[PDB]
């Protein structure tokens, strides 16, 4: 008797996958869904990248020596490094994380003088902690010291109006000396006060003398404080010592008018890996770059950029063919 049969393929060994009903169902073919391997490079082909090296990203603003080449950077991708420092003379920024976030997306920074001039005082204080040949300071500010040696310190005002149509980033420092001897040696004797006024911002600060553990061989500290000054608005510094003054204001290339020094929002990453101008990626993490066709990744939940979605699972196999049912006898 003549006969015709309908049938479908099968293979000796298939791949297990999961369905809704069942687990470990064998199919003719499957493919992985979850990327598990990264590129141990920062893949920078076709973007403008800056490796900030040992320069902490906040350093770009105030300008310790290690940041000299980075005071006006233009970047599509900013690579912070693990060892970085924002400082030379020891100290902290208030709201430090907030600012890091601001710089990371800035697209780079552009500097412009604030036209502060002085006359009564020394405006060139220098430390061994900021070595740039002999001794210098924060490139972008000025350490306002007592003009003689033990001279009480003038009750000075300084004012700067934001000319541009972008926000201006202004930063100033408060000098916490190592001893009350050195404080009134470098400034005046009576209690010292710094008032900083915006339209919006309004708060004040005064100096806490006292010995702290030496950091870069300095017992002193600087509190760094910062504000974004709105277009049109003005800021007034009123101070009688212990004041580290801004010299240049910062602007973010991301808010500039279509012209040179624009960039557009950048992506800040933090990374351990060597740069490679020779590969691409839009997704980064500490170990480097995730460039993958798959839709998920299990490498690093903190990957940043344009990324496969992160999942806790290492493998999620996707069936590319029918249930595998071997040939009977």
């Amino acid at each position: 008797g003549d006969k015709i049969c309908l049938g479908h393929h099968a293979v000796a060994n298939g791949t297990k996958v999961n369905t809704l009903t069942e687990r470990g169902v064998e199919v003719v073919n499957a493919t992985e869904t979850v990327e598990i391997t990264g590129i141990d490079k920062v893949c920078t082909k076709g973007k403008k990248a800056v490796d900030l090296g040992s320069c902490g990203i906040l350093g770009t603003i105030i300008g310790p020596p290690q940041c000299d080449l980075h005071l006006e950077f233009k970047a599509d991708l900013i690579i912070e490094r693990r060892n970085s420092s924002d400082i030379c003379y020891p100290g902290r920024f208030t709201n430090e994380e907030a600012l890091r976030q601001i710089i990371r997306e800035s697209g780079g920074i552009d500097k412009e003088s604030m036209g502060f001039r002085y006359s009564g005082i020394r405006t060139d204080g220098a430390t061994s902690a900021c070595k740039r040949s002999s001794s210098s300071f924060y490139s972008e500010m000025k350490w306002l010291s007592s003009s003689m040696n033990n001279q009480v310190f003038p009750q000075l005002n300084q004012t700067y109006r934001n000319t541009r149509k972008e926000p201006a980033l202004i930063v100033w420092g408060v000098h916490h000396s190592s001893s009350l001897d050195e404080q009134n040696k470098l400034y005046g004797t009576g209690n010292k006060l710094i008032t900083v006024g915006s339209s919006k911002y309004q708060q004040s600060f005064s100096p806490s003398p006292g010995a702290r553990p030496k950091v870069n061989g300095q017992a002193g500290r600087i509190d760094f404080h910062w504000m974004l000054l709105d277009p049109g608005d003005t800021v007034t510094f009123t101070f009688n010592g212990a004041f580290i003054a801004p010299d240049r204001a910062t602007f973010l290339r991301s808010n500039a008018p279509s012209g040179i020094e624009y960039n557009g929002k950048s992506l800040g990453i933090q990374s351990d890996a060597q740069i490679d101008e020779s590969c691409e990626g839009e997704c980064f993490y500490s170990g480097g770059t995730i460039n993958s066709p798959l839709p998920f990744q299990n490498i690093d939940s903190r990957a940043v950029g344009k990324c496969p979605r992160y999942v806790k699972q290492s493998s999620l196999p996707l069936a590319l063919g029918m249930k595998n049912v071997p040939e009977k006898i």
Partner: protein
């Protein structure tokens, strides 16, 4: 002896997803059915459709791997992140498993449809054997077989012979 899909699959069919195996006086043959193969293969591009949900949206750092953020907001951030992770992990596993079910079900579906179509071509000229074959109750030479495969077979041409042999 030959058997259809109800019994099992065909390790030897390397040419397609579905096919016909026949027996007649001139021997035994297997040929892939191209059309239904492509049909099945065409509903397989899940990888970039699973990927077409891969975001337009760019995310930035919210915390710091080098200089730890303040404890309380770091706890909130961390908690939020792990919470979103639970959710995406669950979505990913569900999406894969649903795609997998659909792929398996739809493969059976196509096989079933080819089978139904052949049954209807053969009309009263054949009987289903229960393994996925038709016992054909008339001589069906190679060219007659071909005509079953390419949907040309004219049942009325063999009806009278087939009915006699069935009864």
């Amino acid at each position: 002896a030959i058997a259809g899909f109800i019994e099992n699959g065909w390790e030897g069919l390397i040419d397609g997803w579905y096919g016909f195996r026949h027996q007649n006086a001139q021997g035994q043959g297997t040929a892939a059915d191209y059309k239904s193969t492509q049909a099945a293969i065409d509903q397989i591009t899940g990888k970039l459709n699973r990927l077409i949900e891969k975001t337009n949206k760019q995310f930035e750092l919210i915390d710091n791997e080098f200089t730890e953020v303040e404890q309380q907001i770091g706890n909130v951030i961390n908690w939020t992140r792990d919470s979103l992770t639970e959710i995406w992990s669950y979505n990913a596993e569900l999406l894969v498993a649903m795609e997998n079910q659909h792929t398996i079900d739809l493969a059976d579906s196509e096989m079933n449809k080819l089978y139904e179509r052949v049954r209807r071509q053969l009309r009263e000229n054949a009987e289903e054997d229960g393994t996925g074959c038709f016992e054909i109750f008339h001589r069906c030479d190679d060219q007659c077989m071909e005509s079953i495969r390419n949907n040309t077979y004219n049942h009325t041409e063999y009806r009278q012979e087939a009915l006699q042999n069935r009864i």
